[PDB]
Design a protein around this ligand. Sequence first.
Ligand SMILES: *[B]([O])([O])[C]([C][C]([C])[C])[N]C(=O)[C]([C]C1=[C][C]=[C][C]=[C]1)[N]C(=O)C1=[C]N=[C][C]=N1
Ligand SMILES: *[B]([O])([O])[C]([C][C]([C])[C])[N]C(=O)[C]([C]C1=[C][C]=[C][C]=[C]1)[N]C(=O)C1=[C]N=[C][C]=N1
Ligand SMILES: *[B]([O])([O])[C]([C][C]([C])[C])[N]C(=O)[C]([C]C1=[C][C]=[C][C]=[C]1)[N]C(=O)C1=[C]N=[C][C]=N1
Ligand SMILES: *[B]([O])([O])[C]([C][C]([C])[C])[N]C(=O)[C]([C]C1=[C][C]=[C][C]=[C]1)[N]C(=O)C1=[C]N=[C][C]=N1
Ligand SMILES: [Cl-]
Ligand SMILES: [Cl-]
Ligand SMILES: [Mg+2]
Ligand SMILES: [Mg+2]
Ligand SMILES: [Mg+2]
Ligand SMILES: [Mg+2]
Lengths: 204, 226, 196, 196, 212, 233, 195, 195, 222
Amino acid sequence: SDPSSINGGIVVAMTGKDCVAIACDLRLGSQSLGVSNKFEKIFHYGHVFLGITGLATDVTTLNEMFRYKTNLYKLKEERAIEPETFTQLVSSSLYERRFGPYFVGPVVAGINSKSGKPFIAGFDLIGCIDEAKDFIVSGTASDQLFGMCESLYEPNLEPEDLFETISQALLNAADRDALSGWGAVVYIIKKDEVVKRYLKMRQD
Amino acid sequence: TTIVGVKFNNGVVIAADTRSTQGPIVADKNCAKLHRISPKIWCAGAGTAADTEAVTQLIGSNIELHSLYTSREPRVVSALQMLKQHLFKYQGHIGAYLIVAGVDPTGSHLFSIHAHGSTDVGYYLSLGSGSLAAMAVLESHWKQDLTKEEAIKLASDAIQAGIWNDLGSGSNVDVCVMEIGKDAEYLRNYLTPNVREEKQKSYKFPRGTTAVLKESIVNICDIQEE
Amino acid sequence: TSIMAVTFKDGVILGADSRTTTGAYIANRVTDKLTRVHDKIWCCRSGSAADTQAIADIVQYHLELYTSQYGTPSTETAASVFKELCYENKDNLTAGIIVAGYDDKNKGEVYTIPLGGSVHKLPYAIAGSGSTFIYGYCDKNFRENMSKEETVDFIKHSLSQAIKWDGSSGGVIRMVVLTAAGVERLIFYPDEYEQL
Amino acid sequence: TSIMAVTFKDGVILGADSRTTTGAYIANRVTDKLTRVHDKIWCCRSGSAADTQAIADIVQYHLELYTSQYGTPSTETAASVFKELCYENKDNLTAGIIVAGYDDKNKGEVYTIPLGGSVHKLPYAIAGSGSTFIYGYCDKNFRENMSKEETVDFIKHSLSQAIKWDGSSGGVIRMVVLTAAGVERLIFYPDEYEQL
Amino acid sequence: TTTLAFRFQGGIIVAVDSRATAGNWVASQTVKKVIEINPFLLGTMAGGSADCQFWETWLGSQCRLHELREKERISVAAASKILSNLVYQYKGAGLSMGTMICGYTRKEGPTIYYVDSDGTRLKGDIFCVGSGQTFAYGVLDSNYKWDLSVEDALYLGKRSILAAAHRDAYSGGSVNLYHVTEDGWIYHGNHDVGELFWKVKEEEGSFNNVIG
Amino acid sequence: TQQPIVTGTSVISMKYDNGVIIAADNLGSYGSLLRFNGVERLIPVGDNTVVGISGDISDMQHIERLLKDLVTENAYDNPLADAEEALEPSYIFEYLATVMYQRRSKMNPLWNAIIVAGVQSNGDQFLRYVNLLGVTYSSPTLATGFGAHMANPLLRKVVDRESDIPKTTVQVAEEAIVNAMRVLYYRDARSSRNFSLAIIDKNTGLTFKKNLQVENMKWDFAKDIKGYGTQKI
Amino acid sequence: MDIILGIRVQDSVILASSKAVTRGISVLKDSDDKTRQLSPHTLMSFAGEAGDTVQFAEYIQANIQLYSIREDYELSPQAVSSFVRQELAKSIRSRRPYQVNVLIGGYDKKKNKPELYQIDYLGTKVELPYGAHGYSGFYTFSLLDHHYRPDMTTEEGLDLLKLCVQELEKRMPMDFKGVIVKIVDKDGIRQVDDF
Amino acid sequence: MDIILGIRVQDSVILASSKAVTRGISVLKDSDDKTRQLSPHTLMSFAGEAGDTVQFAEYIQANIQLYSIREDYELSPQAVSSFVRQELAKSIRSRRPYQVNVLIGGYDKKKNKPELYQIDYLGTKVELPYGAHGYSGFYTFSLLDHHYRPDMTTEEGLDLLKLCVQELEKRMPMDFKGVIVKIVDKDGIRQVDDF
Amino acid sequence: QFNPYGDNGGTILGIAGEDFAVLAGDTRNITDYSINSRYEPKVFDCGDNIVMSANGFAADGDALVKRFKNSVKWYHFDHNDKKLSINSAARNIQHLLYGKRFFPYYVHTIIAGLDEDGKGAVYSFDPVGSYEREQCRAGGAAASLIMPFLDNQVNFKNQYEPGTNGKVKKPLKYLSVEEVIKLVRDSFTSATERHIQVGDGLEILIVTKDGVRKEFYELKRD
Ligand SMILES: *[B]([O])([O])[C]([C][C]([C])[C])[N]C(=O)[C]([C]C1=[C][C]=[C][C]=[C]1)[N]C(=O)C1=[C]N=[C][C]=N1
Ligand SMILES: *[B]([O])([O])[C]([C][C]([C])[C])[N]C(=O)[C]([C]C1=[C][C]=[C][C]=[C]1)[N]C(=O)C1=[C]N=[C][C]=N1
Ligand SMILES: *[B]([O])([O])[C]([C][C]([C])[C])[N]C(=O)[C]([C]C1=[C][C]=[C][C]=[C]1)[N]C(=O)C1=[C]N=[C][C]=N1
Ligand SMILES: *[B]([O])([O])[C]([C][C]([C])[C])[N]C(=O)[C]([C]C1=[C][C]=[C][C]=[C]1)[N]C(=O)C1=[C]N=[C][C]=N1
Ligand SMILES: [Cl-]
Ligand SMILES: [Cl-]
Ligand SMILES: [Mg+2]
Ligand SMILES: [Mg+2]
Ligand SMILES: [Mg+2]
Ligand SMILES: [Mg+2]
């Protein structure tokens, strides 16, 4: 009944030293029934990464929508959209559906190509921006993720250390949620290289 | 949320806490609730966070165009009128509860706004879940002919009352001072009485602690030449 | 809310408390419920603060535009504009308004517009939650062609009782006097009217 | 219903209208709401007619049995018996009762028992739907140690206004005087009290 | 919850999962969903944890009192009926139970009774109970035979719970195995699904859908 | 299950160095009607305890009779009724707390919020809360209803934690309480100007103050406030 | 309607769909084909609310056939599935949404690969090796998890499908009157007439 | 449970009762006997809410068996049916009524006549030549109205019963997993093991 | 309509060591968005080296603890001053809770102590009496924030040994009382940051063979 917890899933993002990390589970379900273990929730438009939790049809719809908008942006602007600008675009787009919203929990992550500054941001389903320095969480195990992130996180982690922290934050949060898990992906993002890692986790 | 507004000798000051909450969870610990409508008209917002943001941007945008059209600096009553009429039209469904303050060629002004579109005038005001804690402080310590230094003190004390006693409020105190014949000074994190203590332990993991299945480079670059 | 308007020899006087409540919390203890739609046509507001403000703002706009074309409007005209808004939008409004004004030709007039949107011209009118408690007092004590000082005392004593018994009413007693001489504002504080 | 009891120099006087309604139909226009639970302890009834009769009948029984064992009960005792019934059966009762009585030791006393079943000893009391309209009037006009004639005029004028404004109240104004001299019944008809 | 029990040549196999949830929140992964009523009787637990726990340890007290009074082991029929008659008294009040009472006696042989908080009492060869019962049924019905070895039967039960643990969101944690023969039940260990899945996938060649 | 009919608003209280202070206004409201203006809601028990009650007045009066009966019962066959075996604040509270929870458990609550303020035999300050649900808690400052939202913030600025209690005098504490009552009169639509205040000191005993009024009120600034925005006259 | 299954093997996609049509108390028909050919190498099975199912299926069919004529070209299964998802995603926020769940089985002639897409009435699309809608998956996914290997032949796929249908016929309360099975491969679409 | 049928022929009463036990989504059992022998020449089939059915049937059985021992005599089918009706008529105004419908088939050894009684959970008794509970009658009564003749034979009765079950298996949505058939005559009660 | 239940917030945490056990809980008591008390003890010494906390609706919590304390008293009277073992206490609490199955104590109960072999023991209950011995358990408002952290940092879940890449798990080495208290403090500091009903103070009761010791720590008061 509650649209935001029919399909299930989670996304988490973190900042490190000259790097950002964004991670998500791979589950898609119909309430109790597990349907797919290859439903990735992180997308990217140029060097800007977007994770989306919530109702899966809206996750797909919004990805297609932001691909649409960022492609037109690039043709007109003659440059790739930056994380700060994209964050404003997500907020605008969501709020225009104020009274008929997309049931989603988006998470932006990326590094500004000009300043080199790491950036993350979260949103509610209608556009409010949460621009945290440390971390952003989203999905059915957001409470769990808040608990993991708030204890495990420390500032200025190196890319390979940040990987371990975000991976353990996701995995242990997902294992305390019935509607999350069934695999996981972690993106480690640096100014001009991005590494994508699939995690081995319990398949129940 | 705790937000306040206090008039003084030569202007007006507004303040706010920095906690945003989804139910009993804190979404953001250092949230920015002081919004700029124009250079010398600022308002603080309580209620639905997207709404206070959106309604401020829209009116702020139209105020800017109006200022350019008329070749005059914007007035607080214009922002007030535009905000109330917008909110009334939406019959309370846009959940924005605002304290609007500022200085303009007419003088210094302080107003409140509720979601259904009703406005109120006052020398001291408070809104949000911690408004009762804040108003208790304001009713105990407010007087006529406050100085700038006294008004900032009173405003931040009123926010603190909200921070400590209201569970819907917390973290830091943001202030904005708008004095006549001066630039508005926005004091982000004016007080920081809630820094977290050092943790007992470091939870940095040994590298190779997490099990990995696959690795791959992601192509973020465009299609290449040659 | 405790509001009233009373005609007398030299014109009309509007009176009101200053309390605005959200349940049992007093959101504003120094509210001004006496509002100006024209130079010598004012109104008392009760019910929703948003609705009565929105209405009063629109009326002021209509009467400003009326004045620019046809000169000063009558109090009856002002009441009619209020009625048109309150009647035609009765499903969506919660507004109980008393309209009071001073012409030179018609002198002091009072029109009350309750929830339905009906209009009633009266020598004096009372409204708001606190008015219930002073129907007896006001009926017994009202006379026509009172003096300014007598009418001020009548409103002061009346609203004092309304405040005393109604939790939704309180604070200061504001008044606005409308005569040929001009527009005078009066204020009366708790220490004064409570000992009456 | 408009009911009241007022203490004065020589004792206490109870007053009431005579209207009983089933919605907007007046089921009885000559009702006697002033009822006797003891020689010089009476009560005014408001709310459910069935409930207040059942209660008053039980109280009269208790005070009759009290008298047979311990002699004449005090007015306070009578009020306590009313309270015990109204409080302990608050979930199932709709009764607003004013108890008034005359002792030689305590003279005239008035106790009001609202819906909850709480007791409040007062110099005078008002109750019933019509009482709302005369809080202002009664507060302004009540004095302690009035004469019999003054108290009759106070009740007559008060209930007149309550009747004038309340649809649930009307008919004749009944009164019962309780003094050392004895028990006197008074009645006042519409033609008399409407012109006040 | 996924719990199963089935009769075969070597007696009875009982297999259960370990997960307990409050909404989407995983409350526990280490729940004992099998109770040792005595050395010969087992009860499975599904539905309300408290209801199942309380009334099945109560059942063990009634079974002990029977064999004290009658100088003889209680039958599976009699034991299951004590529980079903009890819950029937509480019918409508809101008890939430789905249980298998499993045992072996001389007069009956291996016996399984499905007992239910609506008052249903059914004797049978195969039962699966819980939110993930349908998933377990698939594996069982296609691989079940009377002539299974204790070793093969134990694996089938383990595998059927694993199948449900994977698909059913309200099942998982670990697998507890029991084997019931004439001489009493015999515990066959706790098996973590997080390790069992990757083991079975590799060795069996199953779950080719999942990447490992 | 019922609904409250005639009701009393906030009861406020705090500890200080040598004892406790408690206060409550003298109003009995009937919905929005300010019906009864002479209702005492502080009820002393002996010379060492004061019970402050908010909520339903009929239930308050019932509780008042229970406490009166409690004193009578304690005196029975008790030569030390006015000495070592006198009623303590802790005894009186625990009794009420037992009753409140029992009544909620029969789904027929006494619709009240109660604060028991007093001083124990050994001079220790006692201050504890109980309500219609049987919920209990203690704190250097306690308040019911609106007092919880408006009084506590002001009273916690004087005594923020346990260690602030010995540093707080009776003059400073009373001042804080009286100010809180004024604030509640500004802002609570079901309050009255008239109130009662009680001080229980370990040295000077029980001081019960009746017919107090809220004074030194600020209203003058109202004259400058005109309209709701754009209006100038 | 009730049970619709899908499974993709080495070189084909197999769709099984029940034959029963029940309107309340009676089984009105026991030979109903719950599928439409969208293009020569793309088949869509469907199940949901009465009327809406066929109306939607035929509406999609018409649109794909129109595309085929206009461009003289067959759309990829991926392209068709994306079109269908968009129609359902549009539908869910309409005055009266299409209450229809579908499986799209197609053979991509460009990549020489079979493809199976599962899309629910909300517009929730997933590519799978095997899929189902409604209560079918609750029984069949455990068998397919266990028995499925991605390199099966079409004959092995049909045997695994028989094992699914047998389990459904054992444990489901509703009599769905057997299934119509259809195979989608490089040579197009054909129906298995004996199942 | 679901389908229970009854038919009285010349010299016997035949009761047919479904074997399925379905709880929500799964069919837990396909060999359930929804009947109890009350006495050597009296059989009662039953269907209704879970738990209540067996509880009621066994409670009646116990009472009739008690009567049989006390009096060393078998009650007539009419007498047993009246006892059962009274228990259900008492039940319907209880705190929690028995939600059980029954058919009582018996052979009266005194009158040498078969007898079939239909009683619903309200305590509504009727003697019939053929009867049913639930949705069974909606299909089967038309066939029985046509084909039923009162001098039929136990085998003709079984053939007519097969025609009823075939119609149910064709038109009913629920799979009731066939029926257990039992015959009540002068020689007592026996079960037809092949149907 | 009258609602007999309420929510007093708070959070509790029990951890069983090798020869000790801790039961911690914050000291904040609340209703809705108001603070009732910054220091209202929630974890209690019940005698016989058993500590208990019933978190949730405080009135039911106080009632349950009061009745269990009473049960310990009467266990001594009725069985010759025999020490009530932790397992026996747990079963006794199940019956106290299930006794009100159809009008439950709206609380999450946790007890801690030592078993009869001297090893650390924690038991956890739901509102209607289902219970289970556990190594680790958080209860109450911020339980969802704390438990995942404890799965990771107490049971070393999802942690493996460097160089082996997922093949070899991190070995389950035992934790000292000083190590456990560090994890408890960090759990509550983290919970305080992200949960509005957690704060003010942290009170920890430590149980060893020597007896019951207490430790108090300040938490953020916003
Ligand atoms: B304050 O407490 O009123 C605060 C001020 C706001 C401008 C940041 N309000 C909120 O934080 C609201 C509370 C709320 C919760 C639920 C519905 C409506 C309002 N929070 C949010 O709007 C919110 C919640 N989660 C994410 C983003 N925004
Ligand atoms: B008066 O009490 O009717 C008053 C007059 C108004 C014009 C200021 N109205 C209110 O105070 C209303 C509530 C109300 C009380 C009694 C009857 C009807 C309505 N208040 C508001 O509309 C309100 C409250 N809080 C914030 C904004 N507006
Ligand atoms: B009075 O108006 O309260 C009156 C006093 C009663 C003692 C005679 N009560 C009634 O007239 C009531 C209705 C009512 C009116 C107003 C408030 C509460 C109740 N009438 C009856 O109880 C009644 C009506 N018709 C027949 C019998 N009883
Ligand atoms: B199983 O999922 O049915 C399981 C078995 C039980 C014996 C532990 N039940 C639960 O997990 C129930 C919830 C439930 C989920 C799905 C179907 C039916 C019931 N949970 C609890 O009983 C529970 C939850 N939190 C604490 C304690 N017990
Ligand atoms: Cl206003
Ligand atoms: Cl009468
Ligand atoms: Mg699972
Ligand atoms: Mg009348
Ligand atoms: Mg019938
Ligand atoms: Mg706070």
